[PDB]
Amino acid sequence: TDRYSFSLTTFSPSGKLGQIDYALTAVKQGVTSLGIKATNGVVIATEKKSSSPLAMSETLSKVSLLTPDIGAVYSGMGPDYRVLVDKSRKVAHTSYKRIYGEYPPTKLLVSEVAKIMQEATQSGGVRPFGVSLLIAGHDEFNGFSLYQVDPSGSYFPWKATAIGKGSVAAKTFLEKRWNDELELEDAIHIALLTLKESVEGEFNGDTIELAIIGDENPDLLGYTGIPTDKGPRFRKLTSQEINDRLEAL
């Protein structure tokens, strides 16, 4: 049989829920990622890591695509991120590209994924996924938006934030480095410079993964001859583009 349907998350005698207190520590035992929100775009940047140096790193993704306007990036556990990215996409199609026949706004996508975490907090046979996600995306009506979904199932919008183990120091660095108008060109130099204070590792495009929800690219459209729609506003930055910016810091 089975009889694991009793909650394995319970209130603690001192209050607060023990299992979500445990999961958050775990996020600061991980890799480091940060996101800066610019006026005209959004950037996320993170470190790529593997067991041995003889492992690849192009066959691994820690910036993943939910929609053509919305990417996610994590800090926490690799295995636990992989499954929730898939579930994030599955619920984005079934409840918004079938019923409105288009992609969801960033706020609306955030909220869906926050329910999935929530039933990992409630009920038996689950323990919380041990990740913190950033969900930066763009929708047309509220423009650029940056979120953070936590182990607990709440979300928060931020103007600039970081997650991972080098987090406490990184948000202090970005406090003085945030400005009221920051351009996307300028921001790219910022995120690299912050994550350089946070990463010792050999600093190339091949170890720093850069993704922007900048502006629309009609060349990643995959078709032409439709002027009505426009291409992906997401654009994953491969090693060559980051290498020029390495030299410009």
Binding site: R3, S5, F6, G124
Partner: protein, 237 residues
Amino acid sequence: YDRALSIFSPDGHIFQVEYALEAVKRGTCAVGVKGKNCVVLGCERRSTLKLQDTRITPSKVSKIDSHVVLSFSGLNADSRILIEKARVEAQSHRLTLEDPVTVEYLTRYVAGVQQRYTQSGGVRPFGVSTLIAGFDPRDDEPKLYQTEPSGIYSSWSAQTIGRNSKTVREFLEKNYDRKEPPATVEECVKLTVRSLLEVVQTGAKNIEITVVKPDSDIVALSSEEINQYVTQIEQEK
């Protein structure tokens, strides 16, 4: 889930029925006294807290049919699940058998409801004890029943449940008579107010009284009314 929340005890009990009775002890106190042609349920409300909306909030006496009232002591939150079952059974009786329910049939139903959550797996008993009172239709005998979280039902001549019920029960041996109720409706109300003033105390604003007369007349007396009845008792005492 199908695992027990009821684990048999070597004592000749189940722990959770003993725990459920304490929970009832800690609850607000209800009195029931039946006249010759009325029923009277008096209940304590803690109105001690200030800036309480009392208009919009339901009394601790709920009508479940047009002639059957249910009052309760113990877990207030839990009680509402019982009140929703019982209102549902009342219609079902009209549907399939016709006529309104009898107080006895409804009391038995309640008895089997609280009983169920003892004997089933996956559930803990309700720690809620009811006073079910009312009239049967075509009839004018007041019938006053008490059901308790053991899922045991009783008829009573007069009863009290709740906090410090014992103090009122000793008073009721001595001022209500098994042989003779007080015959006017008014005197019966004042006998129950006079009883309430033992433990409740602290002014007459924490007293609430619902009076039911046959032929389907449930009216609840306001504070003003109580104020006059209490002052009389006060002066005479």
